[PDB]
Amino acid sequence: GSMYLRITNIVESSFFTKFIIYLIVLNGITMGLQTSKTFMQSFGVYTTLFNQIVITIFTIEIILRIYVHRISFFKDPWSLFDFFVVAISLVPTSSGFEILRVLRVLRLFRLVTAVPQMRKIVSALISVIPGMLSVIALMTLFFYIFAIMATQLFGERFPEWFGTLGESFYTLFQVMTLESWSMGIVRPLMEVYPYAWVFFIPFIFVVTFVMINLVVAIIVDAMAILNQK
Amino acid sequence: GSMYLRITNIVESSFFTKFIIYLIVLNGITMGLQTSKTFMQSFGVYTTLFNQIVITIFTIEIILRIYVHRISFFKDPWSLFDFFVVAISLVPTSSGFEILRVLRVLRLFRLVTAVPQMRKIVSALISVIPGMLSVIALMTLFFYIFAIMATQLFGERFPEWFGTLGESFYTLFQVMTLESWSMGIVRPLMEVYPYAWVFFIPFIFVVTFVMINLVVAIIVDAMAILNQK
Amino acid sequence: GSMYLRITNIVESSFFTKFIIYLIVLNGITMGLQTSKTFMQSFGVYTTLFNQIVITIFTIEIILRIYVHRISFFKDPWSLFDFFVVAISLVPTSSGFEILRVLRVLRLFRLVTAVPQMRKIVSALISVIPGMLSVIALMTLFFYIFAIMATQLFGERFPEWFGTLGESFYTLFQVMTLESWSMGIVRPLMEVYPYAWVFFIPFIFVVTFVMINLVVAIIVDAMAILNQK
Amino acid sequence: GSMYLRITNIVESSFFTKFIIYLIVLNGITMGLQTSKTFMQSFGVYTTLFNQIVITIFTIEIILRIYVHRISFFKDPWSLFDFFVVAISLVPTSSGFEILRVLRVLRLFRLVTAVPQMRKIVSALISVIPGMLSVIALMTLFFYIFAIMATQLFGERFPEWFGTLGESFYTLFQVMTLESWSMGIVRPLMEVYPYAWVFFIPFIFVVTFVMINLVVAIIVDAMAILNQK
Ligand SMILES: CCCCCCCCCCCCO[C@@H]1O[C@H](CO)[C@@H](O[C@H]2O[C@H](CO)[C@@H](O)[C@H](O)[C@H]2O)[C@H](O)[C@H]1O
Ligand SMILES: CCCCCCCCCCCCO[C@@H]1O[C@H](CO)[C@@H](O[C@H]2O[C@H](CO)[C@@H](O)[C@H](O)[C@H]2O)[C@H](O)[C@H]1O
Ligand SMILES: CCCCCCCCCCCCO[C@@H]1O[C@H](CO)[C@@H](O[C@H]2O[C@H](CO)[C@@H](O)[C@H](O)[C@H]2O)[C@H](O)[C@H]1O
Ligand SMILES: CCCCCCCCCCCCO[C@@H]1O[C@H](CO)[C@@H](O[C@H]2O[C@H](CO)[C@@H](O)[C@H](O)[C@H]2O)[C@H](O)[C@H]1O
Ligand SMILES: [Ca+2]
16 A cells, blocks of 8 residues: 555665664663662652553554564564563563663663664674584583583582582682682692692683683684675 | 965974974983982972973973964874874973863873874774773663662672762773672672572673673774785 | 393483483483572482482393493493493492582583584584694693703792692693793792793793694594595 | 814714703603602612702803804804803802702703704794784783872772882782682772773773784784795
8 A cells, every 4th residue: 555655765764764763772771870779869750651651662663563564573583582672661560570770771772773884883793693503512512511510520529619519600700700719719729639720720721721712713704704805 | 475484494404303202202311310209309390390381392392383384283183183282291380189280191192292202102003992882881881880780789788889870880881891800809709699690690700791792893904804805 | 142132222222311301301301409508408318319210220120231232332432431431320328528529510511522513513622633643742741841941040039830740840841831831920939030031932832833733633634535535 | 174073073962962952851750750859768868969960061161162152152142041041040059049059940941042943943932923023012001001090099098009109009910810800909909999981991901902913913914924835
């Protein structure tokens, strides 16, 4: 129909999508003043009020551009995100956790969707991830096998650090980033277990070698693309 | 006029600008001995005295080379800097803060202006910054959205770290550099909030992925320029 | 013989090796639930039972594919690994240390052997190591010479950090990763030994210069290979 | 003369220089067992005895190869080093400091001189340094100007960290490596000086931008050489 075209040249319009970018920037400043108990005690009304207006508008416009583009709307990753942070946001307060009240702030990520220069650079960042998969595979297997070892070795005398398989995972991740791996983790262990450095000096070495190579992978792959294009 | 040319071939002279480089190096050694309470108690007079002589000379010469080059002086970034650290310096003591007394030391950055090899390498460093803008954009939006979350989640029971939106920003920046993110920030939070690692392990991951890519961006862009030039 | 070919087209089969990949994934989930004292108190029987079944199967199949390929089996690094983590695993409990009971978990690294995409990426990582050898040589010599110095200088008044040649090695390695090198190591030393920063500021500088170059070595070597291939 | 050629084909011989490599490796193992108070109490005699034999041999051979090559010996950086760690070593004990007794261990760096594969990789590492000079220049000027500021701002209430111009330099260097810059340096300062992060968040930013670029400089320069050669 032609009323269809009337609605498409509204919704595909520059001004329509530019308007909801201003609605994004407005609701980001509001989002930020909500973290002020002073502001909320004066303008807590006008503010949360403004937060409900922007959410109906995004649902009015997610129903509108779900109509303009019908099923094609759903094979698009960026539209799915706008649908799934509008709806994560669409849940009302005092229902569920507060964790949903805070995840409503995820709707600021609609700025990355509605802005072109931003969906470009995010396309770059995710374009990189297919290549990293084999090393992130190898990498995980390593953290798994070494978390099992570390729990079996240390989980009984250092339970806050190696009790769970998970507690072990976390500490190891922490050690990988060299966050206090020595004065804080390994040195305290050599007070009970003297040859513990045999477990962590190998460990530090291997995940640092693999991080270097993961990054050289990003660097050469990109260079190869540039060279071939 | 020809008295104009007399003043231009003075001010565009090698010796003129080389002389104010020695005045820079002299006033840097003086600048440094001023931080010695011993030195200041003997030669505090001769010293601050020397600091007032170099500042009139730079204003004599900023009035001179503002005359030689008239308006063109102002469309030049390096001359604006010399004008704005001479004048930040031109404010007298006991007026305002001490923060202006110390910012007078910024006039040592005139060494980067008056030396060619130095304005070259600074040109390299700033030439890099136009490219970084889209990722620094994305990056900020992320720190904002996640500071709001983190205040809403933790600002009441950990007020020194998540009370303000700003307190949150700082801690997050701190966590990004892996400065005691674990034994110091996240582990203390898991004493009250057990599933806090769900907020920071994602967070550490995303800003490390984006830092890697920002740096691979610098590396490939530069490589591309070299290849095409 | 043709019974030989009957056994080879069994053992070189897709399904045979795919089956022992499922046996790997099964014995990894089991491996992981063993670290649960709750799980072990109910299903400790069924579980360790399952661990003995998978080890006979791997020895049945290491005797099988040592037959199919006879001596060639042994000039292959990945088969040697499967032979040496099956046999490290083949030792029975209550004989030796517990350190062998835990190293049995190394048999999960059979997933990297039995999966193609995984032996590829490990081939990449080890392919990189021949080049790094001269800098790892230089590097070690440096840690040695500087551990000897550091013990001679500090081992008597700081025995937990510089008593052994080994204690010195460890601390230095720790300092190299910038793990609390300052508030934790060097600042406490400047309470007794004031000009200690002369030993560690040079040291931090040299191993950071050499790490940068080691990584630029990986990056240019790989780039050169890409360019020439 | 021909006795000259007799001495040159001795000193330029493979076996001559290979022999003093074994003397290097021997005196490195000895060097290392000297840090053992147990070893020194049994074999302290045989050991230090061995240390005096190797030093006469190196002076016999530094007088020999100073004769074979006369003045050309001195325009060679690697021979100057062998002359200046033999002579730093030639000073006798109980004269001067112990700091000279320990610097005798520097003579192990003769292994890098006497081995070809080693003087190669050190040639690589130093070949890189001419390029880094302009950024290390800019870099220093920055640490200087900002150490002066930081002493003027904080040296009176935090004297162990900002009292000297030097104390300031050290702390800043420490902050640059992100070693406890937050929970340890800047957070304690915001207890007295609340807007201190304005001094260090800019500071952390600028030296991290410049480190990234210094390393991209190494990476592209090397790539350019590879491409043009
Ligand atoms: C936009 C969507 C993004 C989806 C996120 C995808 C995540 C992909 C994982 C990549 C992140 C790796 O995670 C991060 O790796 C860095 C690598 O610098 C490691 O960090 C450590 O390793 C490096 C090696 O490079 C050490 O030299 C360094 O001292 C330290 O930073 C940590 O292990 C982890 O903090
Ligand atoms: C001359 C004028 C200069 C104007 C300044 C322009 C500033 C531009 C911003 C670039 C600086 C980024 O700021 C800095 O990023 C580094 C990236 O190494 C991060 O630092 C961290 O991230 C890296 C990833 O590379 C981790 O692997 C690593 O363990 C840690 O160093 C921090 O987040 C921050 O300290
Ligand atoms: C798959 C089999 C693998 C066999 C393992 C082979 C090991 C080869 C050794 C390479 C590992 C080097 O070991 C690791 O080097 C990193 C380099 O990032 C150093 O780590 C440090 O150096 C870097 C320089 O890049 C600093 O800028 C940084 O703040 C810090 O991470 C440490 O010294 C060590 O943790
Ligand atoms: C063989 C003779 C050698 C002569 C020595 C020549 C020295 C030349 C100076 C290069 C060394 C720079 O010194 C070192 O720089 C590293 C850069 O990784 C910095 O270290 C820091 O900066 C990086 C940026 O890359 C941060 O992202 C990172 O978290 C941290 O490691 C420190 O400021 C310092 O420890
Ligand atoms: Ca730290």
